[PDB]
Scaffold this active site. Structure first.
Site, PDB file in Angstrom:
ATOM      1  N   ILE A 154     -10.528  -3.741   6.617  1.00 52.46           N
ATOM      2  CA  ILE A 154     -10.626  -2.313   6.178  1.00 52.46           C
ATOM      3  C   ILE A 154     -11.091  -2.287   4.714  1.00 52.46           C
ATOM      4  O   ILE A 154     -10.509  -1.531   3.902  1.00 52.46           O
ATOM      5  CB  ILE A 154      -9.316  -1.524   6.439  1.00 52.46           C
ATOM      6  CG1 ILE A 154      -8.104  -2.085   5.691  1.00 52.46           C
ATOM      7  CG2 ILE A 154      -9.033  -1.415   7.935  1.00 52.46           C
ATOM      8  CD1 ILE A 154      -6.899  -1.165   5.713  1.00 52.46           C
ATOM      9  N   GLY A 155     -12.114  -3.088   4.396  1.00 54.22           N
ATOM     10  CA  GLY A 155     -12.920  -2.988   3.163  1.00 54.22           C
ATOM     11  C   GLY A 155     -12.540  -4.024   2.116  1.00 54.22           C
ATOM     12  O   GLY A 155     -11.940  -5.061   2.477  1.00 54.22           O
ATOM     13  N   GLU A 156     -12.896  -3.743   0.860  1.00 54.88           N
ATOM     14  CA  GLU A 156     -12.652  -4.595  -0.338  1.00 54.88           C
ATOM     15  C   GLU A 156     -11.727  -3.836  -1.302  1.00 54.88           C
ATOM     16  O   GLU A 156     -11.809  -2.588  -1.346  1.00 54.88           O
ATOM     17  CB  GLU A 156     -13.992  -4.956  -0.991  1.00 54.88           C
ATOM     18  CG  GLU A 156     -14.007  -6.313  -1.670  1.00 54.88           C
ATOM     19  CD  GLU A 156     -14.170  -7.491  -0.724  1.00 54.88           C
ATOM     20  OE1 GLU A 156     -13.707  -7.396   0.433  1.00 54.88           O
ATOM     21  OE2 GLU A 156     -14.766  -8.501  -1.142  1.00 54.88           O
ATOM     22  N   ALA A 203      -9.239  -4.920  -5.108  1.00 51.22           N
ATOM     23  CA  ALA A 203      -9.375  -5.317  -6.529  1.00 51.22           C
ATOM     24  C   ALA A 203      -9.790  -6.793  -6.598  1.00 51.22           C
ATOM     25  O   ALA A 203     -11.011  -7.046  -6.651  1.00 51.22           O
ATOM     26  CB  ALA A 203      -8.091  -5.038  -7.276  1.00 51.22           C
ATOM     27  N   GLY A 262      -9.181  -9.147  -4.304  1.00 58.01           N
ATOM     28  CA  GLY A 262      -9.473  -9.648  -2.950  1.00 58.01           C
ATOM     29  C   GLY A 262      -9.803  -8.497  -2.023  1.00 58.01           C
ATOM     30  O   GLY A 262     -10.200  -7.433  -2.547  1.00 58.01           O
ATOM     31  N   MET A 263      -9.607  -8.700  -0.716  1.00 60.04           N
ATOM     32  CA  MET A 263     -10.008  -7.780   0.380  1.00 60.04           C
ATOM     33  C   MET A 263      -8.766  -7.224   1.084  1.00 60.04           C
ATOM     34  O   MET A 263      -7.691  -7.839   0.987  1.00 60.04           O
ATOM     35  CB  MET A 263     -10.882  -8.496   1.417  1.00 60.04           C
ATOM     36  CG  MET A 263     -10.105  -9.243   2.503  1.00 60.04           C
ATOM     37  SD  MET A 263     -11.151 -10.379   3.479  1.00 60.04           S
ATOM     38  CE  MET A 263     -11.505 -11.651   2.264  1.00 60.04           C
ATOM     39  N   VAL A 264      -8.950  -6.113   1.802  1.00 58.20           N
ATOM     40  CA  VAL A 264      -7.881  -5.374   2.531  1.00 58.20           C
ATOM     41  C   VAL A 264      -8.182  -5.498   4.022  1.00 58.20           C
ATOM     42  O   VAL A 264      -9.375  -5.436   4.388  1.00 58.20           O
ATOM     43  CB  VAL A 264      -7.819  -3.903   2.073  1.00 58.20           C
ATOM     44  CG1 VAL A 264      -6.586  -3.190   2.599  1.00 58.20           C
ATOM     45  CG2 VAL A 264      -7.903  -3.795   0.561  1.00 58.20           C
ATOM     46  N   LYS A 315      -3.253  -6.263   1.477  1.00 60.03           N
ATOM     47  CA  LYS A 315      -4.235  -6.571   0.419  1.00 60.03           C
ATOM     48  C   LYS A 315      -4.025  -8.037   0.048  1.00 60.03           C
ATOM     49  O   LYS A 315      -2.911  -8.359  -0.362  1.00 60.03           O
ATOM     50  CB  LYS A 315      -4.028  -5.719  -0.844  1.00 60.03           C
ATOM     51  CG  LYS A 315      -4.170  -4.207  -0.648  1.00 60.03           C
ATOM     52  CD  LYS A 315      -4.007  -3.374  -1.928  1.00 60.03           C
ATOM     53  CE  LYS A 315      -2.628  -3.511  -2.542  1.00 60.03           C
ATOM     54  NZ  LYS A 315      -2.352  -2.460  -3.553  1.00 60.03           N
ATOM     55  N   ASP A 333      -4.929   6.307 -14.109  1.00 63.91           N
ATOM     56  CA  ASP A 333      -6.175   6.188 -13.309  1.00 63.91           C
ATOM     57  C   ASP A 333      -6.049   7.047 -12.067  1.00 63.91           C
ATOM     58  O   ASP A 333      -6.463   6.621 -10.985  1.00 63.91           O
ATOM     59  CB  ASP A 333      -6.480   4.745 -12.946  1.00 63.91           C
ATOM     60  CG  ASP A 333      -7.915   4.451 -12.528  1.00 63.91           C
ATOM     61  OD1 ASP A 333      -8.844   5.221 -12.900  1.00 63.91           O
ATOM     62  OD2 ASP A 333      -8.052   3.502 -11.715  1.00 63.91           O
TER      63      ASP A 333
END
EC number: 2.7.11.24
Length: 347
Positions: free
Chosen positions: A21-23, A25, A27-29, A44, A139
């Protein structure tokens, strides 16, 4: 070693049926089936131990999220890492699966006035807790607001978070900043390090405006363009507001600008609930001193269907002291990350 877009995504016994389910910080999710709780989850992969910067943000976020317990703040359900510092190259953080975020939702979906009200209520309810812990998120933006299929909203991404320090907030003009340009309070470009709670309220104001139109209200292309976008809508700062900017470069920059009149909110947002625009006005106040506080926002008439201060909890355990991560070497930061994640070990 279970793989995903083969790289290594090695997640315990209990987390199976990995779907990318994407990228993220560092690493990847990937979503996965928590074989214990029998619910799908978000995991994550974080790989930060090379970079001092990656280590500080990772530790900051882990320390904050493990201390916080709130319905509108993403929780850590689990942390998967090696049993030793030597073997620990990656950390896996397990959280409730949230199907979408407000960035993705605003790209394609119209929000009803009821959804906008409910989402804002939840943002401010989570922010009250955050601020009550003496923490600033720094943020807030639509992509850091997670949503599930029943519109439960959770704030995430405390990478840039800091302990509040209003006494030490002053800085010179054009000081470099990291947080998302479009959600930056005017003072960040003028005289502020973003160490006061008012910078988060500005961001929420920007998010409310983006919910009302499905477009960012202040999409600046460069650091000073951000200011031009803001002053394009609020108009030139008053003498009183300028009087609070004693920094000569910042004051004389503002004085150098052509006079601009305020654009009425009702002109930008003709379909908007008038109470929403009233509250927007108070969140997008130029002078951070006059800007509405989180608890005042929750008490605003726009939110009267939801407002219940007894059900808007504050933190039991505020971060009273600065977390001095600035020049700890990586190796210290890896040990603190190891120690901070220890409660999740069978070990």
């Amino acid at each position: 070693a279970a793989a995903a877009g083969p790289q290594v995504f090695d997640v315990g016994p209990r987390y199976t049926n990995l779907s990318y389910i994407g990228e993220g910080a560092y690493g990847m999710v990937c979503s996965a089936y928590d074989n214990l709780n029998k619910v799908r989850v978000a995991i994550k992969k974080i790989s930060p131990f090379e970079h001092q910067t990656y280590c500080q943000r990772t530790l900051r976020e882990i320390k904050i999220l493990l201390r916080f317990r709130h319905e509108n703040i993403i929780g850590i359900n689990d942390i998967i890492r090696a049993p030793t510092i030597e073997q620990m190259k990656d950390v896996y953080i397990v959280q409730d699966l949230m199907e979408t975020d407000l960035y993705k939702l605003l790209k394609t979906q119209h929000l009803s006035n009821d959804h906008i009200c409910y989402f804002l209520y939840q943002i401010l309810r989570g922010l009250k807790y955050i601020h009550s812990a003496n923490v600033l998120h720094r943020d807030l933006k639509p992509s850091n607001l997670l949503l599930n299929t029943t519109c439960d909203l959770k704030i995430c991404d405390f990478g840039l978070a800091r302990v509040a320090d209003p006494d030490h907030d002053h800085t010179g003009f054009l000081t470099e900043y990291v947080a998302a340009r479009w959600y930056r309070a005017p003072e960040i470009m003028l005289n502020s390090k973003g160490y006061t709670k008012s910078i988060d309220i500005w961001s929420v104001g920007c998010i409310l405006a983006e919910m009302l139109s499905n477009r960012p209200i202040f999409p600046g292309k460069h650091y000073l363009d951000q200011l031009n976008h803001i002053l394009g809508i609020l108009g030139s700062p008053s003498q009183e507001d300028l009087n609070c900017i004693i920094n000569l470069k910042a004051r004389n920059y503002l004085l150098s600008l052509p006079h601009k009149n305020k654009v009425p909110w009702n002109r930008l947002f003709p379909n908007a609930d008038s109470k929403a625009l009233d509250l927007l006005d108070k969140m997008l106040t130029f002078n951070p001193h006059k800007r509405i506080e989180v608890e005042q926002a929750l008490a605003h008439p726009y939110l009267e269907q939801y407002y219940d201060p007894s059900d808007e909890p504050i933190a039991e355990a505020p971060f009273k002291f600065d977390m001095e991560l600035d020049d700890l070497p990586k190796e210290k930061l890896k040990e603190l990350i190891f120690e901070e994640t220890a409660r999740f070990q069978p070990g």
